[PDB]
Amino acid sequence: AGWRTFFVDNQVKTLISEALVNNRDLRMATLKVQEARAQYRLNASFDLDFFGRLKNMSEAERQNYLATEEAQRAVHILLVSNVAQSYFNQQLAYAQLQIAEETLRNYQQSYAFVEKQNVLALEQARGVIESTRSDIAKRQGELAQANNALQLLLGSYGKLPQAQTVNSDSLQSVKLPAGLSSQILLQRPDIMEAEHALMAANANIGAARAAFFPSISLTSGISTASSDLSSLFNASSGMWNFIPKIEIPIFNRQQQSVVNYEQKIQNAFKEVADALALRQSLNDQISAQQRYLASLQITLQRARALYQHGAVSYLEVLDAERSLFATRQTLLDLNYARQVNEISLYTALGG
Amino acid sequence: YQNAGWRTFFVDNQVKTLISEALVNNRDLRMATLKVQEARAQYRLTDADRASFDLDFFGRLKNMSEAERQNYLATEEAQRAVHILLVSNVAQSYFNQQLAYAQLQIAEETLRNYQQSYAFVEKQLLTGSSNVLALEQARGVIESTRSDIAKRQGELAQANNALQLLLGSYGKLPQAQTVNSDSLQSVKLPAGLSSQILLQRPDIMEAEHALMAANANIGAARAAFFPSISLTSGISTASSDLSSLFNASSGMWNFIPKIEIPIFNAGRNQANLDIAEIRQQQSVVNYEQKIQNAFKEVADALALRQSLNDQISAQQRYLASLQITLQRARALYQHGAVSYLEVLDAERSLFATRQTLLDLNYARQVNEISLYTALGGGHHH
C-alpha cells in the first residue's frame, strides 16, 4: 500500500482508498480506467503498455494473465495512478477556470475604461473578452471530463470534491526516504514478469539478481537522486554504465530472458532517474515562480495605493493584475506537471 | 391573439396541447382561479391526511373583499394574471406527471435489478459463497424499492388529479412520453430581446394603472424609470446590458433614473395638494420598485437556466460513459470475463445517474415556467 505513504495530499488518498474498495473485480477496473481515458481522445506509457499488451492477446490469454500476481500488481498501480491523475486534472481545471473568470472580469473593466476615454484598441478588448469567455467554456468542459473520470474510477454516488485551495503547501512533493534501496524496483510488474521468464528458462534468481541488478541507494542524504544512481549513467553520454559480473552461474528461452532482464532493469533505473531529476527541476521552477508571484502581489498593492492618490491610470492597476493572473497560471501548469511526474515516480517505483 | 406567448415559448408539443385544452375549458376567470387553487390543494394533500407568483396572487385575492375581488378581476392586469396562472399551472402539473412516470419507470427497473441480485446471492449462499447479512441487505433494498414505487405511484396520481382539474371532464391525460437523453436542453430565446416585453407583466401593468390614476404622463414615467435595454445576448443568455444593471457581487441595482420631462403636472391645485402628491409619490416609488424586481427576476432566471444547462450537460456525459461501460461489461460477461453481479452493479450506476438527470431536467422545466412568468407571458413582441 505504498500509495498511502507516497501521496501527501489527504483528499487524493481518500479518493484512492474509496476506489480500492469499489474495485474488487480486476477486469471491471480495467474497463473503468479505459473509459476514464478514452473520454478525452482517440505521457502514461505504463497505461499504453498495459492496454496494448492486453489487447494483443486472446480472451483466454487475458483471463489467465489477470490471475498472475504481476497483473494484479499492475492493475493496482493502474487504478491508483489514474484516480490520482483524474483528481489533479480536476483540481487543475477548477483553478484555471477560476483564474479565467477573474481574467474575464479584469478585461471587462479594461474595456469599459477604454471606451469612457481608439476603436482599434476598443475592439481588441472585445476580441480577448470573447476568447476568454470561450476559454472559460473549454475549462468548464475539462472539469466535466475530470469529474467523469473520477465518478467512473470510483462509483455512482456523485459526491465529487470541490476546489481545494491547498496551495503554497502541496505545491511541493513527498520527501523521499534518504537511502531508498534500489531493490524497491523488484516489485515492478515488468521486472516481476522478467523474473518469471527467468524461472522459465531454468535460471537461479538469486544469481540473476546478484549479477545484473545493482544494489544501491536511489536517493541521497536529502531525497534527491543519489550519487550512486547518477554514476550508472555516463555523463554527457547519458548511457547505462553497469558491468554485470557473473560469479555464481545463472542457470541450473534462455539468453532472451537475460537480455529482457538487463533491458527492464536498465530502463527501470532510467525511469527513476528521469523522475528524480525532473522533480528536482520542477521544485526549483515552482519556487522561483513563487518568489516572483510575491513580487507581483506587492507591485499590485503598491499600484492600488498610487491609483488612490491619482498617481497612475486605472489601466495600470488592471495591467498589474493581468501579470498576477499570468503567473498564477504558470504556477498552476508547473505544479500540475510536478504531480504528473510524481505519478511517474510512484509508477516507476512500482507501487 | 395573446396565445402567441405560450405557443412560441413552450417548445414541447404535448404541453402545448394541454395548455390549449385548459384555456378552452376555462373561459371564466373566477372559475379558473378555483380550479387552480384546488389543483394545487391536493398536492398539499400529503400533509392534511396524516411558486412565489401563485402565493402573491392568491394571497392578494383573499386579502381583499368580495366587492374588491370582482372589480380587480375586471381589470386588464388581472386577466393577464389569470392567464399566466392557468398556463403556468398546467405546464407545472404536466412536468410533475412526466417526472413521476419517469421516476417510476426507473424504480421498477431498479426492483428487477435487485431481484436478480437476490436470486444470485441466494444460489451463491447455498454453494457456500456469501454472507447471510448479504441476503438481508438484498431483501431490505427490495422492500424499500417497493416503497418508492408506491410513493411515485402516489405522486403520479396527484399530478393526474391536478391535470384533470385544470383540463376538465373531456381532457385526455398523456401517457408516459418516453425521453431522449440527448434532447434535454431548453427553448433558445430570441436574441436581443427588448426589455419592453416586461411592460406586459401584470405587476407592472398595475403599477402603470396606478400611475394613470394619479395622472402621470406614462410616456414620461417610462422614459425616466424603465431601462430600455436588450435582455438577451447574441444567443439565449443574459446580455451585458442586463448584467450591468446590478452592481457586481452586491446584487444592488445601478440604474439612476433621470427625469427630463415632469411626470406629473403641478396638480389641479388646492385639490388636496399634499395628498395628491403623496399618491403621486407612492405610485412612483411603487413603479420603480416593481421595475427593479422584474429585472432581477429575469436575471436570476437566466442565470439559473445557464447553470442547470451546464449541470445537465455534465450528467449526459457521465451517462454516455456509463452506457458504454455497461455494454462492454455485458459482452465481457458473455465470455466469462466478469461476474453477473458486476453487470448488475454497473446497471445500478446507469440508474442513479438517470435519476439525477431527471431531477435536473425537471428543475430546468420549473425554471422555464419561472422565466415565462417573469417575462409576463412569453417573449412575443
Give the largest interface.
Answer: A-B, 22 and 25 residues
Fraction of residues of chain A in helices?
Answer: over 70%
Structural class of chain A: mainly alpha
Query: Treating each run of at least 4 consecutive H or I residues as one helix, how many helices of chain A?
Result: 12
**How much of the polypeptide of chain A forms β-strand, as a percent range?**
under 5%
What's the number of structural domains of chain A? 1
Radius of gyration of chain A: 25 Å
CATH class of chain A, named Mainly Alpha
Give a structural overview.
Two copies of one chain form a homodimer. Chain A is mostly helical and 351 residues long. Helix content of chain A is 70%, strand content 0%. The first copy, chain A, is elongated and about 90 Å long. Chain A binds chain B through residues 25, 27-28, 31-32, 35, 39, 59, 62-63, 105, 140, 144-145, 147-148, 151-152, 155-158, and chain B through 248, 310, 313-314, 317-318, 321-322, 324-325, 328-329, 332, 335-339, 342, 346, 348-349, 352-353, 356.
Features:
homodimer; 351 residues; mainly alpha; Outer membrane efflux proteins (OEP); 12 helices; elongated; membrane protein; beta barrel; dimeric; Cation efflux system protein CusC
Summarize the structure.
Chain B: It is a multi-pass membrane protein; Lipid-anchor. The structure is a homodimer. Chain A has 351 residues and is an all-alpha fold.
Layout of strands and helices, then pairs:
2 copies of one chain form a homodimer.
Chain A: H1 3-6, H2 10-22, H3 26-38, H4 45-55, H5 59-65, H6 69-116, H7 119-153, H8 189-200, H9 205-212, H10 227-230, H11 254-308, H12 314-349
